Amino acid sequence: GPLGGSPPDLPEGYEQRTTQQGQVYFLHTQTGVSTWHDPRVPRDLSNINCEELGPLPPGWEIRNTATGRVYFVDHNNRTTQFTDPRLSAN
């Protein structure tokens, strides 16, 4: 049921979720909304290259999407991310 401790690097009112095959996304549990951008993190700077801020953490893989938009694959929660693991956490 209810549990608390450490936030999953996400703003207030939102909740991270995964699509059928494990696609991480940001949903508004309140209005069942679905968006790709993370609120806590800026709009302009969403797809950042952590390589300049710090190495990728355990359980992760960096890649590029067809449009050339890099992402990451976390093998901790078995999913694919859009925003960096450190971005949201600053």
Partner: peptide, 20 residues
């Protein structure tokens, strides 16, 4: 074929590797 939204498909679903 459209999967989701008009053109909003950035991070590919999970499976250790970009699985369609």
């Amino acid at each position: 074929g459209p999967l989701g939204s008009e053109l909003e498909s950035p991070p590919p679903p999970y499976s250790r590797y970009p699985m369609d």
